[PDB]
Structure formats: C-alpha cells, structure tokens
C-alpha cells in the first residue's frame, strides 16, 4: 500500500542523488534514462540482486580476508553445564549481518527499509495483495519477488572450508580426535559493542561522570572499563565483512586478560635508612589501594556482620598474600645481598627477609641468620600492619572488633609459620 509508494519515492530520491553528480556534457539524458528505468523496473532489477545475498551470524572472512568457506546462520542450543557464555543467552534482540555485493547491500537495505513502517520485515514472505498494489509490481512480478525474497532469506550455501582457517583438533575420551573449525561471531560482538558504547557514551554516563566529579549522589550507577585493546579489520574499507563492520568502522575493543603484575618496574631493594623505614611500611600501588580499602572498611556497622566479616577476612588474606608475594619478589629479584650503608632496621629485617649470605655478606652472619629465623621481623611486620589499620575503642568495646583482632592474629600466625618454615 503505502510501503511501495515509499519505496518508489526512495527510488526517485536515489535517482535525484544520482543526478546530483551530474556532468555538463551528457549527464542529463543518461540520468533521465536511469530514472525512467528505475521507476519502471526497480523490483525487477532488485530481484537479481536479492538472489545474491545471504543472512549470516558467523563469518569466516575476519579470520583472513583471502579465505572463503561456509558461512552459517544458526543459533545453537544452551549447553547443559550451567554458567557459560554463548549466543544462546539472548534470542530476542539479535541483529544478523549479511555478506554480499555492495549494490546488493543497497538493495537489501532498501528491502529492510520497506520491511519497516508496516509489518513487512516479518511479512515479506506472507503478503501478496497489498504489497503488489503498493509496489506497482504485478501478480507475476509479485510472485517472482516473493520467490526471490524467500531465496535471499535462505542461506544457499555448500558445506566447505578453506585452507587458511584454523580447523584444530580436540581429543576424545580414550579415543581419537575431531576437527574443530572456529567461526568468528559477529552478532554477539555487535551486541556487546553496542553495550560497551552505551557504557562509555550516553547522557547517563556523562551525567554520572560529572556527578563523580561533584560527588552529588543521586540514585544512579557508574561503570568504567580500564585498558582495552583495539583491533582493526582488514584494510581501509571495513564493509567487506558486513554492514555491521561498516557501522563499527572495522573496530573491535578487547577486554584485558592479564596476569596481576604485568608492569615489571625496578625494585627499590637497596639500603636506604628511610628506604628501609618505608619498606617496613611497604607502600606500593596495589598495597596502597588495599590499605585505602581497609581504612574505608573500618567504619562499617554490624548489621551485615556476616558479609562484612567475610569481606574483611578476604581483604586481610589478600593483604597477607600480597605481602608474602612482594617479599618473595623482592628477594628473588635481588641479584645479590649488599651490605646496606645505614639501613636502619633493614638489616634486622633482612636477616631473614633478605637474600642468602653471598660473598658480600659474612659467613658467620649467614650462619647466625640461619641459627635464628626472623620471628621478630614478623612481630615488627604485624605491628606495622596493626598501625596501618586504624583501630579504636569501638572495636575493643565491640565483639566484632575482637573477632577481627582474632582473625588478624590467625593471619599473622599463618604468615609467621610460613616465614619460619622457609626461614632457617
């Protein structure tokens, strides 16, 4: 009805846009002939283009542009093992991307735009009378258009792969292998690219940003993503994957998947007296963040005392593990044990928390350090940790602070036992 008239108006607008690039020599007559041919047989020209195009959710060309294989439109079932990530998690909000010729992509975009407005996007298969009455196509032209649209909506592919795919093995239980060819998902990354764009950009996002600059706290959330990596698809033109790669501009943001200490910085192990005093504190970036979180978690209440005690125990265990790991990294990162000039208490701690007695150290001092493990170094470290954690009489007067002191004592005892087992 009105959709075919809108398609004819869009064809006339495309003819006017093709007449905007007009040549003064002979562009007028060619533009008039092209507009006449378009307004005559736009559907007859578009059926042969819609026969060429296929809708797809998994694509092989992002693996390599020179390879060609089977491209599949399929939503696999949800697996039995719970707690996973796949395409099965969403079914209602999918957006399929198509591979094909560029003028065919223009014809498919025109067919999708005619699919909007009315219910034509789902009714392109089941509609004869109103569609043929609106489009100006006849009964035979409408039947041929319905056949071409049912063909373009179909896959129409042969099962084959290429030599530049991955097609890896996976062993079977107690038996042989299968070949496993992976396909690049495109609808899933279009969805999460939309979600990541909405996270990084949006009125609510910038409003929460200026909120966290002004610390005005209206009921709202604020998300943030650190250290993404950016990948580029193909050469300069991105649409050769699909039109989804045209609207994503050939860009995919990658999530960080890193080991904890991936910035190998130099160690300030050396014998500074104030350096030894600060190393007894041990102010680091992650250690400073943990100390800030522990200081912020001091003023809590006891209504969530189960979850609060669990979070406090997890934070204390993480702090103890980070301290032991930093001590081990400082020890093994040390190439040799040097006699520190004026390392005030640094020698008393580094009798055990420092490296083995090398040629720079005395053999009698090494035997004396092997005679007595650093229990007093553990006591000084527990004292520095208890001084780092802000305490008050509310914890002394309350039973929850006594339980937190008992948990800190158990953690300090475990750390002292782990130190004394390796020590000596």
């Amino acid at each position: 009805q009105e959709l075919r008239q809108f398609i004819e108006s869009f064809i006339q607008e495309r003819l006017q846009g093709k007449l905007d690039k007009l040549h003064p020599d002979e562009d007028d007559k060619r533009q008039t002939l092209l507009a006449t041919h378009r307004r005559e047989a736009w559907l007859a020209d578009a059926a042969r283009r819609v026969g060429q195009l296929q809708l797809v959710t998994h694509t092989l060309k992002p693996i390599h542009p020179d390879a060609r294989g089977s491209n599949l439109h399929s939503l696999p079932q949800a697996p039995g093992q719970p707690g996973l990530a796949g395409s099965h998690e969403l079914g209602d909000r999918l957006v399929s991307d198509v591979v094909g010729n560029a003028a065919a992509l223009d014809v498919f975009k025109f067919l999708s735009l005619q699919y909007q407005g009315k219910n034509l996007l789902n009714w392109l298969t089941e509609d004869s009378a109103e569609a043929v009455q609106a489009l100006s196509d006849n009964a035979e032209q409408a039947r041929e258009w319905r056949q071409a649209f049912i063909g373009i909506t179909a896959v129409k592919g042969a099962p084959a792969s290429h030599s530049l795919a991955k097609q890896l093995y996976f062993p079977l239980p107690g038996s042989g292998y299968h070949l496993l060819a992976p396909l690049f998902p495109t609808s899933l990354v279009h969805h999460v690219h939309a979600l990541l764009r909405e996270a990084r950009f949006g009125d609510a996002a910038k409003a929460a940003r200026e909120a966290r600059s002004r610390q005005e706290s209206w009921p709202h959330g604020f998300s943030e993503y650190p250290n993404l990596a950016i990948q580029k698809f193909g050469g300069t033109k991105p649409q050769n994957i699909s039109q989804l790669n045209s609207e994503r501009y050939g860009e995919n943001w990658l999530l960080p998947s890193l080991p904890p200490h991936w910035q190998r910085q130099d160690q300030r192990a050396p014998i500074r007296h104030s350096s030894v005093f600060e190393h007894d504190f041990g102010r680091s970036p992650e250690v400073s963040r943990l100390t800030r979180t522990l200081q912020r978690l001091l003023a809590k209440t006891r209504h969530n005392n189960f979850t609060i005690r669990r979070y406090r125990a997890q934070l204390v265990g993480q702090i103890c593990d980070e301290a032991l790991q930093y001590a081990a990294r400082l020890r093994e990162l040390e190439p040799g044990w040097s006699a520190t000039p004026g390392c005030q208490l640094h020698d008393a701690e580094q009798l055990w928390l420092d490296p083995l007695r090398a040629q720079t150290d005395e053999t009698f001092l090494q035997r004396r350090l092997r005679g007595d493990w650093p229990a007093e170094v553990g006591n000084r470290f527990a004292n520095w940790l208890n001084r780092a954690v802000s305490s008050d009489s509310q914890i002394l007067g309350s039973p929850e602070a006594a339980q937190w002191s008992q948990e800190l004592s158990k953690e300090l005892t475990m750390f002292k036992e782990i130190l004394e087992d390796e020590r000596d």
Binding site: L180, V192, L195, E224, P226, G234, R264, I418
Partner: protein
Amino acid sequence: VTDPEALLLLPRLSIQNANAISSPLTWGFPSPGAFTGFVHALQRRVGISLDIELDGVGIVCHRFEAQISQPAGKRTKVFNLTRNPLNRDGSTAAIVEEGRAHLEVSLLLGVHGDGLDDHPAQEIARQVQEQAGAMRLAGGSILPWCNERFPAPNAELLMLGGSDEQRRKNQRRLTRRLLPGFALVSREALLQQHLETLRTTLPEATTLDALLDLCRINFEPWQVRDKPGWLVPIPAGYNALSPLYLPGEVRNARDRETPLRFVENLFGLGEWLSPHRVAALSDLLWYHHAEPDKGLYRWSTPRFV
C-alpha cells in the same frame, strides 16, 4: 577423574613470540587448551615409549612481557605488527593483526604409569625434558639454555609416598622452588553463585561475566565494591554448531580420516592465586574432557576446592 601417582615439574620455561590474543574477546595470557594439547602431543612423542600416560598441567606464569604500545591520545592500546614480504606483483601484503608476547612459565605434570618401576625417575625427567626442548607452546618457540644453568635439572615427586607429614614436607619443599609465579584455576562455582545473587536482579547470563570483572564505581549512599580474588575471564572451550560429520564428507580437511564438526567458543572466569594458598598440590591439573553426544567440549581443573 583419576589421581596420578607421581608429579613432574618442568622448571623454568622461557618463551618468545607466543600468541597473545588466543580468543575472539580477550588478549592476555593464552588459553590452557594450548597446554593440554602440548602435553597430549608430548605423550604422543615419547610418553608411550616409556609406559607413562600424562594427564594434567599446572601453570604459574613467572613473568610476562607483551609487545604492545599506547597510541598517545587515549587509554586503549594497539598491537605491534611485523613486516610481511611483498606480494606476487611486488606491491604490498594484506594486513592481518596478531599479538606477540614473551612468557616465563613452569609446568607441573602428573604421572599415572610405571614411574619408578621400569626406570629411575630422574632419567625419565631428563629424557622428557630433552624431548620437550624441541617444540613450541602457542606458536612461541622455546628458548634454549641461557646462562641460568641453575634451573637446568628437573624433579620427579611421588605424591602419596611415605607418611602424611612426609607428604607435607615434600610438597612444601616442592612449593619452595615455585615462589614468584601465580597459579591459575577455574572459578565456575563463584560464577554460578554470583549468577544466582544477580538473578535476584534479573535473569541474564553473559552480562554476569561482563559485570564481574570491571572497575565498577558505585554512587555514594564514590565507593568501589570489590571481588575478593583476581578474577580474569577465560575461554572454557567450545560448543557445537554442526552435526558430527563423516571423515571424507567435508572438503579441504587436514586429514580425511577424522570426523569433523563446526564449533563456537565457550567462556568462563578464572583466578590467579599464590601456590601457598592451596595445601594439596594435586588440585592443580587441567583436564580436557570431551562430551561428543552434545557440544560441551571442556577443559578445567576439577578436585581443586
């Protein structure tokens, strides 16, 4: 699913140009499927020639170095590429992106077969080290000996030999040579727990593993609520997309004597932790177990918690 008899330790493995991406979503450490396939190929190398079968792997990642850079105007990062040679007419190659990295790892291998029965264990460890020193892990070629001649020898450790306190002593003296690295597990249980605590909000599944590993800044009641561990996402494996296909019926295979199927990646969440936080060191072996009746192809470390 099976407890090995002895534990084998690969001391200090230094790699260069290992593949960084290894995933359509992540770019950090490579998947443990490469390690499981590595010890499977190692078992196919000299494992059957010594009456030994090998089951699982432990990884610690002593140090990391990725050839990456920051493009001076934003907070993202671009990868670093290399120069392919010229095309057929001599114009220019086609640019594909790939990530390289440098690793330092150690491998912990379980032994089920006749360890001390057929041969002494140290010669077995020495010959399997000599065999493994001619392969690659994830495209990354193994470096040879450098001037650290100290981590040259290997070690074999029967886990259940002797008393219980003797077991604690030998596992602790094996842990002592494993200090600076951070072991990695699966964390599907905490993922399911936070699913059900987030299903109280709404029933979504992938948004869980989206939300659980980002810097989430809550409003003032400027707080940042935190997860206890170092939770890192990981590809769990594969789910099917096609039926099981005949070994000849598909064109352009590697070999026409192996069945074929099309798959899509499955994902999960791991965690990096210190080896002194676990007591049983046999809780740390990755096992790729296949379930071909459905699509669930899965590597994990069970018997860990």
